[PDB]
Write a protein that binds this ligand. Structure first.
Ligand SMILES: Nc1ncnc2c1ncn2[C@@H]1O[C@H](COP(=O)(O)OP(=O)(O)OP(=O)(O)O)[C@@H](O)[C@H]1O
Ligand SMILES: Nc1ncnc2c1ncn2[C@@H]1O[C@H](COP(=O)(O)OP(=O)(O)OP(=O)(O)O)[C@@H](O)[C@H]1O
Ligand SMILES: Nc1ncnc2c1ncn2[C@@H]1O[C@H](COP(=O)(O)OP(=O)(O)OP(=O)(O)O)[C@@H](O)[C@H]1O
Ligand SMILES: Nc1ncnc2c1ncn2[C@@H]1O[C@H](COP(=O)(O)OP(=O)(O)OP(=O)(O)O)[C@@H](O)[C@H]1O
Ligand SMILES: NC(=O)c1ncn([C@@H]2O[C@H](COP(=O)(O)O)[C@@H](O)[C@H]2O)c1N
Ligand SMILES: NC(=O)c1ncn([C@@H]2O[C@H](COP(=O)(O)O)[C@@H](O)[C@H]2O)c1N
Ligand SMILES: NC(=O)c1ncn([C@@H]2O[C@H](COP(=O)(O)O)[C@@H](O)[C@H]2O)c1N
Ligand SMILES: NC(=O)c1ncn([C@@H]2O[C@H](COP(=O)(O)O)[C@@H](O)[C@H]2O)c1N
Ligand SMILES: [Cl-]
Ligand SMILES: [Cl-]
Ligand SMILES: [Cl-]
Ligand SMILES: [Cl-]
Ligand SMILES: [Cl-]
Ligand SMILES: [Cl-]
Ligand SMILES: [Cl-]
Ligand SMILES: [Cl-]
Lengths: 355, 355, 355, 355
């Protein structure tokens, strides 16, 4: 529901000489806040007892707004403090989750960096696939039912598993059922797709509405448990174990891509952006990520995406190989966001970046 | 035996205007020496013919003290040169090994950064486990004998192996016995623990006695041979080979952790420090490392630790994502050590950091 | 054929106040061009429609020379523009390929950084092995025929495979034959060598002819598809699949080596350089790479090498742990090349670095 | 005559990926060119034999366009090279002089940073006084004739002199007449104004059309010959000499103003800008200077001004106290100009800054 006018008229009552940058203390906040400080902003960090130490010891937040539980950040009391501090909120994974995507779309009355409407297209598998398909991006083949399996597939609902036949699908579904890991409701709505065999590149882009340009900021590969621990056990020992893979994100490793593939990398970003303009105006604003796998034919297949900042940007908080190229600076995604905010304020174009 | 008074009174006869930083040319010396230079110190590097090139070409040492063999660094001749150069020695893995931990505790009369007594708690498995257990840190389950195996275990004595049953334990012990890799004495004192299946995070902390604060400096994951080569062979081919895994440290890869896990990361550091104060006064001084595995339940299990600088700090000699956050600088662990030395000298608190 | 005199006399007609650095827009050009800009050069990038975006958005090239297809860069029309721009060309993988190594040796009349003759010793397996063998570097054992297989081997011709017996060799050769991946001509000239089981370190060196010194600039490990995707599938699932490994380079991951191994690392560089002086005068000039595997005995075995810049230097475009050590700068290989060019021009020694 | 459309349509045919910055090698070019390089531009310097050394040894120009004499820079041959190089010209004192202000207004068909029309308001004393008077800025009292002198005055036409009475005016005019320094035509059109007794502050501002903001970049005091040499002779010796003062600009000395006076400094800049918008649309663009004297009542009296970059910006080529404040950078006026050009190109607003 929340209008752009409701937001612009909230920001119009802001002290334009004291604009701060706020975010919830988690996910990617460390470089969101650091980047803001480095661009000259004073920063606000929503935190809580037990989870504030990293933000205190890294000295990255000027003002703390403590909540009883991160769920409270939707409360009207918290929205007010943020408005009185002249904060533009930078949204991220943990924030959307703890606040509630519905509360974010029509209950959170605080200016927010990015395209508020498009956060819904990252939450729903159908919208995401619609976007990527319509943008013209390679994705994994989808399988309507366990009976359609004709190759290796991954099945999504942590509770993940791999299958190479219909028979195997049920053997594993059942296994996870009796072990209490999975329930009938989950396996009823199982999502089955082609297992893509390749190298992981989570590609972090930035669309600048001020420059009308898609920029490449960096890349990481996921570090997931238990899978990355499992496959580090020799085959002979794996066969002697009764262990199922899980794919819980635990961290990130820096990576760069083969340079001849950057035209493809950029084209993918350009296409996603051009289509999202049509489907969800004004489209992508700021940080977005394509989570892909590079197959042996040097084709990037995207199995996921984000419409705001992805957690993997943490791998280059001190800048990376790509982010260096622009100005030879240790540029993080967090600082790139802050800069767009800085420039927008200076050019009187806050309306191109907030909603 | 070596007293703190024996050391303070050695340092009291130092030219306080010409304090240098010394270390043995190996392990982590490159950034120990670089960091020192960057903080304004002149540096001394103990080296030898055949092993001096890296320190010469990286231009990181101002004075070289050549020895016939690194074993000589315990010699009274070498301790004298170091004392005449006004050197505070920064200890590390290779230094403690080549010098001799016993020689270090009561025969090495040179001021040393860190808590000299606590180096013994990192050498002995019982002390280490006592510390970690008492600090309240998750560790792998220990197994008293091969007959207690009820899951997958790793067995330690390079000569390592994995077992999933009592039967397998002896099959493998025997295999390694007849191949000459392992002897009856080693397998008699075998250490058997739960094989933890997860992602490796070697977490490098710094406790500042001046600030009374535990800082997070960075993280690496180990790159070990042959294991990391072995598991890169496809399963079908592994099964056709007669090859045992080994876990010889060969290098390090940078990694960052999921941000929501930093409160846990920091809490672990805080607890280790608080307990080590009680058990080995004054406790941890400067660099320490928790070598952990993150399981699918997002719990960090520490299978090892160091009470001085860990080799994995080499992964961020040009700074890392975490070390950047403090001041936006390319800060290495070596430079963080040097700075504490700098600040201690300036505040007349050399007694808080040397022994 | 192309003489050093033919080249020096081409450069002698250059405007020495307007020397630019040129390269083809691919492979490693991003930091070749960035490094040049950072050293004060104006830069020329050969590019084409569809592949120019990365070089435009990273703002790394001052002048673009567009070609219809990268194959045209051999054309006399293109050599002229480069000569009129006073360009010294920095050669790399994609450039030598698209231009043609034969065209490079005697048809490309443009000054070029490096030793032009030695590019042939990197293209031919016999010359390379001669060099490495004569330099005294550990290499994988070679196998004359499938009948000599007495261990695990890798077989080279993407079309690669692993074998542990003569029987397996033919089973797999045949498999790849009927699947259309491999033809009789390829398997007739198959190269069979010892499969080395260890950790990958692609070591990037720089030989400075001005300083007569081999420098260590950085290291990466390869990120290859599908192999690195394949071995991330649990063993039980791999066995259920009919999938062959491929080793297509897709990207790079940063790594550092155990510090005690740097004397070996440096010695290897020193030896390769000393022998290449004898075998191909003046020897190595500028960037060269040893692609190695570290076995459990801590011995580096080199399975490949380059005589110019290797693609893995892309992992440290913002500098790395080793490159930092010299001057505490974010130094890339591209900038190190540019600097040697800068210094050579300033000292009137362009003849030590071009040909 | 030259239209904005004539210029925009010249720039519209420019290769927008290869925009360079050009200027004549004199006046303030060193930091104009340096600043451009620092912002990523390739630079063009118009120079000539005998006057090119500073630009060559400071390594500040990528391309040289040599002319026979600086007067040639109006020639259509030179305008073409500049257009083929995609140069935006940055105008300055020596350029306007050597080219010819009339040639600049309607014969110089090359895009130019700044407001082309307003260069005429800096050349004509009546326009300048109109502007400053209408802006509401304190100026020295004007005197219509030698008979109106009722205080100390300075008389302008190098050929300058000071008078405290009508009688003295003629005594000195005559003196300079018989010495050949001055001719009847000059003294016929003599400009007589109040001698202001105070401290010199040449204040360098920058109006950003993109930000709609007047910025303070720095300040210098003039170093003039022979006057600054004359007044360094003790009074007793001056009285024994037959020497007239001259005020030939020879150099600049850095100075900062009393901080409580910055509101006045800024207000003066704001007023000049607001009025110049009305009188010469779009008004001031980029660099402008108020040359003032601070009297004992702490009032700044402006005796001169420039509508483009003033020579005194040379005093802070490595940045100054004021220019540092924005981002803690060594920011020169030349780099501030280049940045506005950079930002304009990126935001597609080249029309706000060129003409
Ligand atoms: N089509 C696929 N083929 C092969 N592996 C896949 C595929 N899809 C997902 N995976 C693996 O499962 C992991 C989790 O994928 P998922 O689709 O859950 O991403 P996500 O929802 O963005 O979760 P996260 O936020 O933790 O990245 C991926 O990182 C990848 O390793
Ligand atoms: N409990 C465990 N579960 C799973 N893997 C383990 C466990 N303990 C050790 N490993 C593996 O064995 C390797 C060597 O562990 P070890 O306990 O020998 O560490 P260390 O003595 O500190 O040796 P290094 O100094 O080389 O790190 C670890 O890096 C890890 O990969
Ligand atoms: N002797 C070997 N033992 C084990 N693995 C090997 C061996 N030789 C090659 N490999 C694996 O195959 C990959 C490709 O090796 P190859 O010899 O084709 O290198 P290359 O020709 O330099 O190709 P690229 O330019 O892509 O690195 C290596 O990166 C390595 O992972
Ligand atoms: N009204 C005044 N009162 C006192 N001194 C003055 C006055 N006007 C000028 N001067 C002195 O004469 C010098 C030259 O002033 P002038 O008006 O010629 O400046 P200009 O034309 O901008 O020359 P330049 O470009 O060399 O600064 C000034 O720097 C100042 O020292
Ligand atoms: N890549 C990362 O480091 C990362 N960190 C977090 N995330 C995603 O963000 C979500 C919220 O993070 P958290 O559960 O740590 O609060 C997680 O469910 C996960 O999908 C990531 N992908
Ligand atoms: N992680 C590392 O790079 C590392 N480098 C050395 N070490 C430890 O330090 C000890 C001494 O090192 P060295 O053997 O290279 O002299 C080794 O036995 C090993 O346990 C490490 N963990
Ligand atoms: N390591 C790399 O990133 C890399 N990038 C390219 N290359 C080599 O350079 C050759 C040419 O590269 P390209 O095919 O991207 O033009 C490739 O065949 C490959 O052997 C590499 N090794
Ligand atoms: N302040 C200076 O350094 C300065 N340098 C030059 N100028 C002005 O620029 C005019 C042109 O300079 P030049 O004569 O050096 O070519 C000079 O007549 C003088 O009025 C200055 N004010
Ligand atoms: Cl992102
Ligand atoms: Cl995320
Ligand atoms: Cl450590
Ligand atoms: Cl260690
Ligand atoms: Cl290289
Ligand atoms: Cl290569
Ligand atoms: Cl100015
Ligand atoms: Cl001037």
């Amino acid at each position: 529901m929340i209008s752009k006018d409701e937001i612009l008229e909230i920001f119009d009552k802001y002290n334009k000489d004291e604009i701060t940058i706020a975010t919830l203390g988690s996910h990617t906040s460390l470089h969101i806040l650091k980047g803001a400080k480095l661009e000259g902003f004073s920063t606000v960090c929503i935190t809580m007892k037990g989870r504030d130490v990293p933000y205190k010891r890294f000295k990255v937040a000027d003002k703390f707004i403590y909540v009883d539980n991160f769920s409270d950040i939707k409360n009207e009391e918290i929205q007010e403090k943020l408005r009185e501090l002249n904060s533009i909120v930078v949204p991220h994974g943990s924030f959307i989750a703890y606040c509630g995507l519905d509360n974010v779309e029509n209950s959170f009355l605080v200016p927010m960096f990015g395209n508020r409407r498009i956060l819904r297209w990252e939450s729903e598998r159908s919208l995401e696939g619609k976007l990527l398909r319509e943008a013209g991006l390679r994705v994994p083949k989808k399988y309507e039912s366990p009976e359609d399996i004709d190759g290796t597939v991954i099945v999504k609902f942590r509770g993940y598993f791999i299958a190479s036949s219909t028979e195997e699908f049920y053997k594993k579904a059942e296994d996870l059922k009796k072990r209490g890991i999975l329930t009938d409701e989950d396996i009823a709505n199982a999502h089955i797709e082609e297992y893509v065999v390749g190298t992981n590149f989570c590609i972090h882009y930035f669309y600048s509405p001020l420059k009308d340009e898609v920029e490449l900021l960096g890349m990481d590969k996921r570090y997931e448990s238990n899978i990355d621990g499992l496959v580090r056990i020799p085959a002979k020992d794996q066969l002697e174990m009764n262990i199922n893979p899980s794919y819980v994100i635990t961290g990130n490793i820096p990576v760069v891509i083969r340079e001849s593939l950057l035209p493809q990398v950029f084209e993918m970003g350009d296409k996603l952006v051009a289509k999202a303009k049509e489907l969800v105006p004004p489209g992508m604003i700021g940080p977005f990520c394509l989570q892909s796998l590079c197959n042996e034919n040097l084709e990037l297949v995207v199995f996921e995406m984000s419409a705001r900042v992805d957690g993997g940007t943490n791998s280059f908080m001190n800048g990376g190989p790509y982010s260096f190229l622009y100005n030879g600076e240790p540029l993080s995604m967090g600082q790139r966001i802050a800069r767009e905010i800085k420039m927008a304020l200076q050019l009187d174009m806050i309306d191109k970046i907030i909603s």
